[PDB]
Design a protein around this ligand. Structure first.
Ligand SMILES: *[C@@H]1O[C@H](CO)[C@@H](O)[C@H](O)[C@H]1NC(C)=O
Ligand SMILES: *[C@@H]1O[C@H](CO)[C@@H](O)[C@H](O)[C@H]1NC(C)=O
Ligand SMILES: *[C@@H]1O[C@H](CO)[C@@H](O)[C@H](O)[C@H]1NC(C)=O
Ligand SMILES: *[C@H]1O[C@H](CO)[C@@H](O)[C@H](O)[C@H]1NC(C)=O
Ligand SMILES: [Ca+2]
Length: 382
């Protein structure tokens, strides 16, 4: 009746090799099978890659792996089976290795007076002891009052309060366990302000507004652009006014400009360190105040032999409409009404007749092009 007497936990190192051994008693002499817990593969007296092979020694088995991978770790099951019965137990293969660094970022940017934390992240088995250093000097040392290190469990942090072109440069994070010492080099670099935005264009223009469009700088200086600043100045003025973009949009709308006015502008990106270089100056001129746009009208019958035109407010042109001029025929007749007006009543018409009408709007600048409108009077009532 098979009974396993020895099946010990094993430890080995990555890329090394290991031997798992199951010892079992019993009459008749027990047969022995290995199963790998993870994928449930079974082994007895292969395999493909040829890394793993099993050899038996009458009442005892051994499973040998060469070139151990981290995926070899975990539980392995030994079953000793015969005609009369079976016994099964389990063991664990632990795999050790020199520390590995899994930090996704090794270059960091800051500037004088701006505190920054650099993080070192390490997987290792057994757990490593970890230190930050510069040329074999562990940090902070007593003579580096601007440095501090923290451990959070899964990270080792070096906090730098930069205050000298000496706080910038390379730092080593070094980790060691009994397999060995490994290290990862980090860089703290001096951030800069952004370079010039370019390809600046006025891509929309009106009387009192304009939208400026541009390309982002080829250099953000090492820390992300936060927003953009557009300076805008009347050529005839000495005072620049400031417009901050909405976030990182490469387009800014200028509001409240004066009509028919020549403006100069320039754009600069701002990052955490400060304001970047200005683009080349760009010039544009806002549209002029003009005459009103052509009026828009429609009508309905108004008793008795009259008709009422209603005004659907239209583009002012920058100066108040103070006068509508309705001329109608079907030779012509004129008629004027005031800007604040809502409608116009034409009177003394004939039944069943059709009329030709032209409407003009006027402001301090002049008259619009006339709007043509025609209508048919209804038949006579009884
Ligand atoms: C084998 O390792 C496991 C951890 O996976 C632990 O229970 C102990 O160290 C060993 N178990 C037995 C039963 O030997
Ligand atoms: C750096 O990390 C430590 C530990 O979490 C934290 O207390 C400290 O405020 C951080 N410093 C900076 C510059 O963010
Ligand atoms: C980090 O360690 C390596 C190996 O000792 C060394 O070449 C390099 O100069 C070190 N960097 C720092 C900042 O000490
Ligand atoms: C501390 O910093 C100074 C300045 O570079 C350096 O010369 C000195 O070696 C450091 N002191 C030690 C070894 O702890
Ligand atoms: Ca620069």
């Amino acid at each position: 009746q098979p009974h396993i007497i020895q099946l010990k936990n094993e430890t080995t190192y990555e890329n090394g090799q290991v031997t798992l051994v199951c010892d079992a008693e019993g009459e008749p002499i027990p047969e022995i099978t290995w199963k790998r817990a993870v994928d449930g593969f079974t082994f007895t007296e292969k395999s493909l890659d040829g890394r793993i092979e099993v050899k038996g020694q009458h009442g005892s088995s051994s499973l040998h792996i060469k070139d151990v991978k981290l995926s070899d770790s975990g539980r392995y099951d030994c079953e000793a089976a015969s005609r009369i019965g079976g016994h099964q137990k389990s063991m664990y293969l632990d795999i050790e290795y020199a520390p590995k660094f899994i930090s996704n970022q090794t270059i960091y940017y800051s500037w004088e007076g701006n505190p920054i934390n650099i993080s070192c992240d390490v997987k290792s088995n057994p757990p490593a002891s970890i230190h930050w250093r510069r040329d074999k000097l562990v940090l902070p040392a007593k003579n580096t009052t601007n440095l501090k290190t923290y451990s959070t469990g899964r990270k080792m942090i070096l906090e730098i309060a930069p205050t000298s072109d000496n706080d910038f440069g390379r730092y080593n994070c070094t980790a060691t366990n009994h397999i060995g010492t490994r290290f990862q080099e980090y860089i703290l670099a001096l951030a800069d302000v952004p370079s010039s935005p370019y390809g600046v264009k006025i891509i929309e223009l009106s009387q009192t507004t304009a939208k400026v469009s541009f390309n982002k700088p080829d250099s953000h200086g090492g820390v992300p652009i936060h927003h953009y600043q557009v300076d805008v100045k009347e050529v005839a003025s000495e005072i620049w006014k400031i417009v901050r973009s909405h976030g990182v949009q490469t387009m800014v709308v200028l509001n409240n400009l004066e009509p028919n006015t020549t403006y100069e502008i320039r754009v600069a990106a701002v990052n955490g360190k400060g304001q970047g270089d200005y683009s080349k100056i760009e010039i544009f001129q806002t549209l002029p105040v003009r005459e009103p746009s052509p009026p828009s009208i429609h009508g309905q019958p108004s008793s008795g032999k009259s008709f009422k035109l209603s005004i659907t407010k239209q583009d002012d042109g920058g100066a108040p409409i103070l006068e509508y001029i309705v001329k109608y025929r079907s030779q012509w007749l004129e008629k004027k009404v005031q800007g604040n007006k809502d409608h116009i009543i034409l009177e003394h018409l004939q039944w069943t007749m059709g009329y030709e009408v032209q409407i003009t709007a006027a402001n301090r600048l002049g008259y619009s092009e006339p709007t043509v409108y025609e209508f048919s009077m209804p038949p006579k009532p009884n």
